[PDB]
DNA sequence: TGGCCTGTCTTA
């Protein structure tokens, strides 16, 4: 795992904490710019090209049948196999939380244009949230989305302008979501007692593993690991969760896929005052510590760090500038 | 006594999502924004009043003027019938505040503009501010250490205030003046927003856009060709719906077709403004046009359609020199109020006609002025 | 390889 500094072009200001990267056919794209989209790029979606350790953001266009979704911070995203991306939730430039679901696909590639379609949701729609997970599980030749966790504003009855921005963890209900028709079913599980946000999520076959996270009520970053199995018979699905020992304690960690069936997670925040400098390896479930990479002193002495998974087993991370550039960016590679 | 949070009051019906506690003063401008290392990074410190409590303190501050104005209109001190308070709402960034890196600040403030009382079925004014634009009557509501173009932070900090003001738009305020309970109801008019902040809070594009007006849907080309017949069209609701249209692309149009459909509204509005004009800018826009007309009438540009840059420059120099000799006007390169005030005179037109050959065009320039 | 449409920086 080698660390590499990156320089950025004129629109470095667009990058902010909560951004996302999506990988389409080896090409990387960036979503969730700071501010509302400007005339220079009306969609807010960018080709994310790092050539010779230099990052260029190039405007991407949407198809005629697309939504123009707002930039979103901390939405739950996953990849769905045409190959497409699922966006649910997030914060808007106006600080509203979106409950909507957007679906991204490559509509046309000339020398890329995207199709962005919103899927309406009925039934037990999850309250709009950020900092939550969504993945796709496969059971008996059927595909279903699993959504869990996060935080949101207070409900309209208790919300008050003096604490207008105050947040609480969402109730820890598992949500099954059929993307074709847009339906949602909520499952209360006895093993999931507390709320959780900014956790890590790993989906394999009919299972989703939940790692780390932060629970607001206790203000604990629990060192538990949860396995979630989903069976899809012809009738109503069945979901069963089990607690597993050996769970790491980390919030806002980043996750990437090395080779096949091996995942590595690079640090997040282990305590409010402390940062998780170590890295973990998950084999599909067993967790082993890895040799910590050659962090520079700037990374070591920063209080805040943020990043995203690029797709190619490589992480794109960023650190805040000195008091006297706004951000300094690095790329950490694996495999 | 003079700070918000001292006198008791009531809202009927109680304000939606606003505490009824009346002993609240200075409160954190972040309004409970999460600050953990996981959440979005908060780079700002701000402090505010709860908008209602501040209205209460400002009215109690002006109690003496209200009673005396009631007297001055030949009305009784003890009347309590519904007073209507008009309130200019205002917002500006304050540039660099730093004491010595730039440290920018936003000030959200209000001004009590007028207070009328209802006697029978005549609305008689009991008070109106003599100096609306003074720093002195601009009551501060929130001060923050942030960039007016830092949209995420701005909405995060201002949105609770707007929520409170929305709440007050449909409620009556009961407040004790001079032993007698009096009842107030408010009309909020966000007229204090310069163009940049209007565009930012109403979901519109940046100032270079083709949609040049925040009152109408004209384009720069339309407004230039169509000189005068334009009407005020836009409203906050129309802008919230035009945003939703941009967002939903219901007729599956291309980005240029969609942009023409929503006439510039590409972001979601979050403040209702009353965009106006400054008398200064009327004078300045007119004077700029007259200056160009003067220099072009000296160069006689109709006869020289392919005139080069340097010929027009010498035209400008000619006009500058002659205006310095005749009107004592130091040519400047940035248009301002005093230049406009001295140039927009009939005598200045006579002076510039002294350099124009055709007197038929003297007729036209003088009538224009 | 441009006009040149857009956003940043400069000077009165
Ligand atoms: Mn301003
Ligand atoms: Zn207009």
From Swiss-Prot, chain A:
UniProt KW Chaperone keyword: no
Residue span relative to the full protein: 1 to 351 of 527
Taxonomic placement: Eukaryota, Metazoa, Chordata, Craniata, Vertebrata
GO molecular function: chromatin binding; DNA binding; histone H3K4me3 reader activity; phosphatidylinositol binding; phosphatidylinositol-3,4,5-trisphosphate binding; phosphatidylinositol-3,4-bisphosphate binding; phosphatidylinositol-3,5-bisphosphate binding; phosphatidylinositol-4,5-bisphosphate binding
Chief site of localization: nucleus
Gene Ontology cellular-component terms listed: nucleoplasm; nucleus
Gene disruption phenotype: Mice are viable but fail to produce mature B or T-lymphocytes. Very immature lymphoid cells are present in primary lymphoid organs. These cells do not rearrange their immunoglobulin or T-cell receptor loci. Double knockout with TREX1 does not show a visible phenotype.
Expression by tissue: Maturing lymphoid cells.
GO biological process, one term: pre-B cell allelic exclusion
Subcellular location: Nucleus
Family from the record: Belongs to the RAG2 family.
Keywords: Chromatin regulator, DNA recombination, Metal-binding, Nucleus, Zinc, Zinc-finger
Protein name, as recorded: V(D)J recombination-activating protein 2
Stated role: Core component of the RAG complex, a multiprotein complex that mediates the DNA cleavage phase during V(D)J recombination. V(D)J recombination assembles a diverse repertoire of immunoglobulin and T-cell receptor genes in developing B and T-lymphocytes through rearrangement of different V (variable), in some cases D (diversity), and J (joining) gene segments.
Documented effect of changing residue 120 to N: Does not affect the endonuclease activity of the RAG complex
Comment field on protein domains: The atypical PHD-type zinc finger recognizes and binds histone H3 trimethylated on 'Lys-4' (H3K4me3).
Quaternary structure and partners: Component of the RAG complex composed of core components RAG1 and RAG2, and associated component HMGB1 or HMGB2.
Domain of life assignment: Eukaryota
From Swiss-Prot, chain B:
Knockout-associated phenotype: Mice display a severe combined immunodeficiency phenotype. The have a small lymphoid organs that do not contain mature B and T-lymphocytes. The arrest of B- and T-cell differentiation occurs at an early stage and correlates with the inability to perform V(D)J recombination. The frequency of homologous immunoglobulin pairing is much lower. No obvious neuroanatomical or behavioral abnormalities have been observed.
Effect seen on changing residue 38 to A: Loss of DNA-binding
Effect of substituting residue 92 to A: Loss of cleavage and strand transfer activities
Position of the signal peptide: none
Compartments reported by the entry: Nucleus
Residues binding a divalent metal cation, per UniProt: 92, 194
Outcome following mutation: residue 205 to Q: Impaired cleavage
Post-translational modification: Autoubiquitinated in the presence of CDC34/UBCH3.
Summary of the tissues where the protein is detected: Maturing lymphoid cells and central nervous system.
Top-level lineage group: Eukaryota
Effect on the protein upon substituting residue 194 to A: Loss of cleavage and strand transfer activities without affecting allelic exclusion
Function per UniProt: Catalytic component of the RAG complex, a multiprotein complex that mediates the DNA cleavage phase during V(D)J recombination. V(D)J recombination assembles a diverse repertoire of immunoglobulin and T-cell receptor genes in developing B and T-lymphocytes through rearrangement of different V (variable), in some cases D (diversity), and J (joining) gene segments. In the RAG complex, RAG1 mediates the DNA-binding to the conserved recombination signal sequences (RSS) and catalyzes the DNA cleavage activities by introducing a double-strand break between the RSS and the adjacent coding segment.
Similarity-based family: Belongs to the RAG1 family.
Domain writeup: The RING-type zinc finger mediates the E3 ubiquitin-protein ligase activity. The NBD (nonamer binding) DNA-binding domain mediates the specific binding to the nonamer RSS motif by forming a tightly interwoven homodimer that binds and synapses 2 nonamer elements, with each NBD making contact with both DNA molecules. Each RSS is composed of well-conserved heptamer (consensus 5'-CACAGTG-3') and nonamer (consensus 5'-ACAAAAACC-3') sequences separated by a spacer of either 12 bp or 23 bp.
Oligomer and partners: Homodimer. Component of the RAG complex composed of core components RAG1 and RAG2, and associated component HMGB1 or HMGB2. Interacts with DCAF1, leading to recruitment of the CUL4A-RBX1-DDB1-DCAF1/VPRBP complex to ubiquitinate proteins and limit error-prone repair during V(D)J recombination.
Protein name: V(D)J recombination-activating protein 1
Organism in which the protein naturally occurs: Mus musculus (Mouse)
């Amino acid at each position: 795992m080698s660390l590499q500094m990156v320089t950025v072009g004129h629109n470095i200001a667009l990058i902010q904490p909560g951004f996302s990267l999506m990988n389409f056919d080896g090409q990387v794209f960036f979503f969730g710019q700071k501010g509302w989209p400007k005339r220079s790029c009306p969609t807010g979606v960018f080709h994310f090209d790092i050539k010779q350790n230099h990052l260029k953001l190039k405007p991407a266009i949407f198809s005629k049948d697309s939504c123009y979704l707002p930039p979103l911070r901390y939405p739950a995203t996953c990849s769905y196999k045409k190959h497409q991306y699922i966006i649910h939730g997030g914060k808007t430039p106006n600080n509203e939380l979106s409950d909507k679901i957007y679906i991204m696909s490559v509509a046309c590639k000339n020398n890329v244009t995207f199709r962005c379609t919103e899927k309406d949701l009925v039934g037990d729609v999850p309250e709009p949230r950020y900092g939550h997970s969504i993945d796709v599980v496969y059971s008996r030749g059927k595909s279903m989305g699993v959504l869990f966790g996060g935080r949101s504003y207070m409900p309209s009855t208790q919300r008050t302008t003096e604490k207008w921005n105050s947040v609480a963890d969402c109730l820890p209900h598992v949500f099954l979501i059929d993307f074709e028709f847009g339906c949602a079913t909520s499952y209360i599980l006895p093993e999931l007692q507390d709320g959780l946000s900014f956790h890590v999520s790993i989906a394999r076959n009919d299972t989703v593993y939940i790692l780390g996270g932060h629970s607001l009520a206790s203000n604990i970053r629990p060192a538990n690991l949860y396995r979630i199995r989903v069976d899809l018979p012809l009738g109503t699905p069945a979901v069963n969760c089990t607690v597993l020992p050996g769970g790491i304690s980390v919030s806002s960690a980043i996750l990437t896929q090395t080779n096949n069936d091996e995942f590595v997670i690079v640090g997040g925040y282990q305590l409010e005052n402390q940062k998780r400098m170590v890295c973990s390896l998950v084999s599909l479930i067993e967790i082993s510590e890895m040799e910590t990479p050659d962090w520079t002193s700037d990374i070591k002495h920063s209080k805040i760090w943020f990043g995203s998974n690029m797709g190619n087993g490589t992480i794109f991370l960023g650190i805040p500038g000195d008091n006297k550039e706004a951000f300094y960016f690095y790329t950490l590679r694996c495999s | 006594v003079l700070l918000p949070g001292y006198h008791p009051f009531e809202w009927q019906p109680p304000l939606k999502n606003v505490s009824s506690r009346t002993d609240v003063g200075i409160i954190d401008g972040l309004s409970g924004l999460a600050s953990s290392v996981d959440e979005y990074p908060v780079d700002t410190i701000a402090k505010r009043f709860r908008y209602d409590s501040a209205l209460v303190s400002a009215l109690m501050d002006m109690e003496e003027d209200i009673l005396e104005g009631m007297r001055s209109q030949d009305l009784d001190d003890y009347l309590n019938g519904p007073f209507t308070v008009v309130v200019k709402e205002s917002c500006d960034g304050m540039g660099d505040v730093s004491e010595k890196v730039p440290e920018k600040a936003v000030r959200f403030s209000f001004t009590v503009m007028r207070i009328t009382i209802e006697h029978g079925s005549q609305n008689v004014k009991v008070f109106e501010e003599p100096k609306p634009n003074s720093e002195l009557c601009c009551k501060p509501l929130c001060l923050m250490l942030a960039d007016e173009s830092d949209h995420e932070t701005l909405t995060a900090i201002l949105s609770p205030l707007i929520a409170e003001r929305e709440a007050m738009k449909s409620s009556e305020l009961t407040l004790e003046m001079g032993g007698i309970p009096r009842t107030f109801k408010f009309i909020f008019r966000g007229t204090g927003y310069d163009e940049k902040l209007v565009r930012e809070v109403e979901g519109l594009e940046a100032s270079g856009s083709v949609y040049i007006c925040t009152l109408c849907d004209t384009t720069r080309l339309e407004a230039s060709q169509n000189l005068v017949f334009h009407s005020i069209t836009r409203s906050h609701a129309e802008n919230l719906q035009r945003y939703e249209v941009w967002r939903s692309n219901p007729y599956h149009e291309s980005v240029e077709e969609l942009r023409d459909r929503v006439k510039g509204v590409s972001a979601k509005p979050f403040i209702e403004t009353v965009p106006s004009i400054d008398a200064l800018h009327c004078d300045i826009g007119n004077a700029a046009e007259f200056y160009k007309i003067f220099q072009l009438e000296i160069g006689e540009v109709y006869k020289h359609p392919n005139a080069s840059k340097e010929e027009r420059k010498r035209w400008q120099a000619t006009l500058d020199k002659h205006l310095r000799k005749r009107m004592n006007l130091k040519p400047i390169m940035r248009m301002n109020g005093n230049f406009a005030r001295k140039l927009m005179t009939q005598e200045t037109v006579d002076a510039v006609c002294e350099l124009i050959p055709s007197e038929e065009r003297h007729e036209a320039l003088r009538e224009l002025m």
